[PDB]
Amino acid sequence: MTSRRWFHPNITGVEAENLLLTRGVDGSFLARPSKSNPGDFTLSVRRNGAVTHIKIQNTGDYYDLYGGEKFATLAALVQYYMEHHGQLKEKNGDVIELKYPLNCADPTSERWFHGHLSGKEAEKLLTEKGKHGSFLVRESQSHPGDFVLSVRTGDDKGESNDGKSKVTHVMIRCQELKYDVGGGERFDSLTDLVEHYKKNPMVETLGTVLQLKQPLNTTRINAAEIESRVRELSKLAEKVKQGFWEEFETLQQQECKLLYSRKEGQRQENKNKNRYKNILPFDHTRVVLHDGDPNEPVSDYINANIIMPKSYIATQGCLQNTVNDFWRMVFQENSRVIVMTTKEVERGKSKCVKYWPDEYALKEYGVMRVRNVKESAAHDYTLRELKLSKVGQGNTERTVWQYHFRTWPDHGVPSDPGGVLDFLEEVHHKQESIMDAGPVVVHCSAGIGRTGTFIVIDILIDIIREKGVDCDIDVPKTIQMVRSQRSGMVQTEAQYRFIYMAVQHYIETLQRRIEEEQK
Numbered sequence: 001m002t003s004r005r006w007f008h009p010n011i012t013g014v015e016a017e018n019l020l021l022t023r024g025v026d027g028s029f030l031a032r033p034s035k036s037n038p039g040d041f042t043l044s045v046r047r048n049g050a051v052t053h054i055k056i057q058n059t060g061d062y063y064d065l066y067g068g069e070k071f072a073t074l075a076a077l078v079q080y081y082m083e084h085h086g087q088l089k090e091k092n093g094d095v096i097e098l099k100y101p102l103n104c105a106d107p108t109s110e111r112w113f114h115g116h117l118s119g120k121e122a123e124k125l126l127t128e129k130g131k132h133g134s135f136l137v138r139e140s141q142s143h144p145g146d147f148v149l150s151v152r153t154g155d156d157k158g159e160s161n162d163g164k165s166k167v168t169h170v171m172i173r174c175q176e177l178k179y180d181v182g183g184g185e186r187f188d189s190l191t192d193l194v195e196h197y198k199k200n201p202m203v204e205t206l207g208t209v210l211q212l213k214q215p216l217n218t219t220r221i222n223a224a225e226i227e228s229r230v231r232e233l234s235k236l237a238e239k240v241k242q243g244f245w246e247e248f249e250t251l252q253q254q255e256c257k258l259l260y261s262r263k264e265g266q267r268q269e270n271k272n273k274n275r276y277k278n279i280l281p282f283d284h285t286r287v288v289l290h291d292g293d294p295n296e297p298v299s300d301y302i303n304a305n306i307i308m309p310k311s312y313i314a315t316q317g318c319l320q321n322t323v324n325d326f327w328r329m330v331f332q333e334n335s336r337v338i339v340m341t342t343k344e345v346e347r348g349k350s351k352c353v354k355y356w357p358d359e360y361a362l363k364e365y366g367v368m369r370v371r372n373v374k375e376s377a378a379h380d381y382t383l384r385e386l387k388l389s390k391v392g393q394g395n396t397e398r399t400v401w402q403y404h405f406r407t408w409p410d411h412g413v414p415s416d417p418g419g420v421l422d423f424l425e426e427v428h429h430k431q432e433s434i435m436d437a438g439p440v441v442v443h444c445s446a447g448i449g450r451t452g453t454f455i456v457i458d459i460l461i462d463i464i465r466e467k468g469v470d471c472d473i474d475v476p477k478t479i480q481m482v483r484s485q486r487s488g489m490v491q492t493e494a495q496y497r498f499i500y501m502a503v504q505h506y507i508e509t510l511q512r513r514i515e516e517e518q519k
């Protein structure tokens with residue numbers, strides 16, 4: 001039960017209207033990218049004979065539901081309003097019920113789908129970029145409107161030598177919407193067909209089994225060849241599409257495989273310790289404070305997750321009652337660099353309180369004591385030299401360098417990654433200059449959007465700055481890997497496209513630098 005089938009990637013506002021009136025009943029719902037606004041998201045629900053279109057906005061921080069609450073993943077929004085029946089109201093006071101997710105048949109958001117592809121090209125990818133169990137679903141060439149499942153069965157590992165590895169093509173005839181292997185069960189979508197034979201593998205005479213283990217891998221590219229990959233993901237034709245949009249929606253369709261328990265944040269005692277009540281840290285990667293023996297009640301909770309591929313800490317904008325716990329986290333984790341990707345107040349709404357003292361001032365935050373030594377005022381950011389110590393104790397003073405990015409737009413992402421790339425280059429060198437410094441504390445508003453976008457860009461650069469330009473990078477796998485440690489890292493497609501532009505702009509400077517060193 002993942003299932004995210006209730007999300008239709010390529011759907012009109014009128015098609016969703018008809019889809020609920022004919023194939024749905026009262027309570028049936030679906031989520032769709034809003035036509036009206038490229039950042040908006042509409043939740044269409046059949047409500048008393050008619051359809052109600054509730055919209056969800058996402059600027060790069062969270063999914064904000066109108067007349068509802070904010071969430072990290074569009075799936076946890078559905079998980080919330082399906083297990084909480086009386087919270088989605090029209091107000092008027094009439095409740096809107098999410099009871100029956102209406103599934104979709106479009107396979108374009110699946111990793112194993114390939115769109116246009118041919119047998120030789122499909123077989124070439126299965127032996128070059130393949131492995132035992134690798135499978136793909138392409139468009140049929142000869143018989144139109146059908147599909148061809150191409151699965152590789154190998155030597156076990158399947159590399160070196162030849163003769164005992166094999167690629168088996170399978171015909172998938174499509175007739176009156178349904179799909180089949182020319183016999184047996186007829187499925188409603190390629191997913192229902194693929195998911196079925198991933199659990200009931202096809203077997204032919206002489207007893208060979210076509211294990212649909214893992215899909216292929218169009219994603220992992222060499223870091224030097226990114227300027228040609230960004231060129232492919234930029235051509236637009238939506239039979240599809242914007243390459244960034246088709247790739248990102250595939251990454252979104254894998255998000256409910258990361259519905260890990262965040263119950264330590266759902267406790268009543270930690271209710272007001274979260275800036276946003278439904279955006280919570282994973283229990284298995286949360287930062288656990290160690291106040292010690294109470295000192296009632298000590299408490300160990302903070303909305304922060306450890307990010308480890310140099311490690312990171314992705315936290316929230318400090319609340320009034322969490323400034324004390326924040327500086328406890330910086331002390332125990334031995335953190336020395338803080339990345340703040342939000343202004344003190346943006347668009348009139350406060351997203352983070354001032355947790356640092358004014359310049360040349362000393363302030364006590366409970367057990368911790370912070371001195372603001374200096375404030376450097378570059379453009380795009382501000383560096384604050386801070387000394388963190390423990391009140392009533394010696395040999396606890398450490399210098400914490402807070403980097404406060406100030407020029408991130410209120411709506412969307414910047415237009416030039418040079419500011420972020422230069423900002424991260426100074427942040428990385430300051431971090432590496434301190435021996436055995438703790439993880440890098442990155443935060444913003446909710447701590448998933450800009451906070452996740454900054455970290456993923458830094459993770460890809462750390463790989464490139466070390467291993468060089470001839471190394472393999474994989475952005476969706478990098479996004480997904482961080483999303484398994486904090487729910488909803490990298491929010492919007494705009495932030496996702498910016499991560500490609502940042503790595504691209506970073507490779508050019510490296511190549512230009514190397515060439516200039518050769519005059």
Ligand SMILES: CC1(C)CC(Nc2nc(-c3cccc(-c4ccccc4)c3)cs2)CC(C)(C)N1
Nearest residue numbers: 108110111113114218246247250251476477480
């Ligand atoms: C075939 C092609 C071009 C790429 C297909 N494959 C993709 N896979 C991903 C993806 C997303 C999250 C994680 C991973 C991943 C990669 C390697 C190992 C584990 C997970 C891949 C993004 S696009 C998807 C579509 C249908 C859009 N077309």
